[PDB]
């Protein structure tokens with residue numbers, strides 16, 4: 001009976017832990033994919049600033 | 062006063078147990094309220110072997126009713142003689158055992174066993190001279206098999222110098238509830254080898270063949286099988302319940318020459334269906350009782366040898382004719398009795414017959430042919446165990462393959478020990 005208790009408990013434990021590891025790595029992965037997308041969009045915003053600036057300077061002609 | 066304490070465990074245990082109490086209650090004149098209304102005092106001289114006396118001229122079975130499920134015990138309390146039983150002697154869980162020996166023996170039954178032993182103690186304490194215990198149970202389920210054999214181990218620990226005998230129903234695929242019965246039966250049999258003095262082996266395969274082939278019942282029910290069981294149980298206990306000077310130990314001494322070989326073949330004559338105008342003749346009782354067709358263990362007595370035999374004849378008849386016919390049947394079967402146990406065939410006559418028959422006879426055979434029953438179980442066990450089939454139901458309750466391997470080996474040693482004495486000569 002002690003072995004039965006121990007195996008049910010170990011099963012509960014490893015299931016709790018496996019899901020926790022998976023929920024965490026999914027949260028990190030999804031966040032990194034969103035962060036990468038936003039960083040790329042942000043790099044667009046600088047390039048747009050650099051184009052408007054480049055026009056400030058062709059107007060200084 | 063040599064009292065017996067009766068325990069019935071599980072579905073099969075309680076169903077056949079209740080029929081037993083119905084049948085002998087009628088024989089002793091006790092009615093469904095425990096009031097005596099008989100016509101002879103032969104009925105009351107040994108009433109106390111199985112019944113307690115309560116004030117008000119009531120007689121209460123010395124019976125303890127056990128199950129892990131309440132269902133089959135609600136039906137007992139419902140049934141014809143349900144009110145007779147002492148209400149505190151109903152000991153029940155709720156979980157059920159799922160036809161799982163491991164649940165009855167190790168997890169669900171362990172939870173309930175101490176409660177059962179409290180009632181056993183409280184019945185034994187009130188016994189002038191406790192003669193021993195009898196258990197009714199099947200070996201194929203989980204409660205009667207697993208928790209029944211746990212009870213027997215506990216009872217031995219607390220009453221090690223007391224006789225422990227059993228009526229044990231063996232599984233058969235012909236009358237089958239689950240595929241795991243050979244597992245449950247094989248585990249139980251090893252327990253019984255160690256911790257019972259006498260086990261009456263009630264083979265559901267024989268009860269089926271009997272009903273189907275001789276009684277011509279095309280669809281036998283549990284009710285038809287138990288009609289035969291109850292007739293036999295009334296039979297073997299006849300000489301404990303009526304005057305004639307052997308307690309359980311004395312019967313064990315003269316029936317069991319080697320301690321592990323205590324598994325008996327029951328038999329009965331006449332075989333009847335529920336619902337007998339022609340009384341049988343002493344010659345007919347005798348030969349039917351020795352014929353394979355009346356054997357309630359599906360073993361062929363001609364495939365082994367009788368170590369000991371007992372026969373109980375019931376009804377008003379000639380003891381001279383009984384002696385003659387018994388000594389007759391031994392000579393056409395003379396090869397099938399070991400010659401190194403002199404006079405190993407013994408007989409009793411009781412002049413009170415069972416209800417509904419004026420002549421009847423009950424057979425108790427300690428034959429080495431019983432090994433056919435254990436070989437059959439062992440072959441069904443191995444067929445699944447070689448693929449570890451269905452074991453997860455058992456490992457899930459804490460059991461290990463090794464305990465199955467030991468049960469298998471212990472079972473095959475028992476078969477080899479029988480084969481040793483079947484070839485032994487003088």
Ligand SMILES: COc1cc(OC)c(-c2coc3c4c(ccc3c2=O)OC(C)(C)C=C4)cc1OC
Pocket residue numbers: 065194195196225226227228259260261297298300307309312313316325371372373407408409425
């Ligand atoms: C646990 O179940 C039991 C099973 C039994 O037998 C199958 C007997 C059992 C009865 O009657 C006997 C008789 C006998 C020899 C042995 C027995 C015997 O052993 O020889 C003569 C003298 C002819 C009388 C009957 C008891 C049990 O205890 C309650």
Ligand SMILES: Nc1nc2c(ncn2[C@@H]2O[C@H](COP(=O)(O)OP(=O)(O)O)[C@@H](O)[C@H]2O)c(=O)[nH]1
Pocket residue numbers: 070071072073074076077158160161199200201202203204205206230232233236237238239242265283286287
């Ligand atoms: N003769 C007989 N056998 C039974 C009966 N009930 C169940 N069995 C057999 O016993 C085995 C299971 O035992 P059962 O009593 O059903 O479960 P338990 O309550 O755990 O003992 C099965 O293989 C059945 O064939 C009964 O009423 N009479």
Ligand SMILES: [Ca+2]
Pocket residue numbers: 172
């Ligand atoms: Ca519980």
Ligand SMILES: [Ca+2]
Pocket residue numbers: 175
């Ligand atoms: Ca206790």
Ligand SMILES: [Mg+2]
Pocket residue numbers: 072073202238
């Ligand atoms: Mg059942």
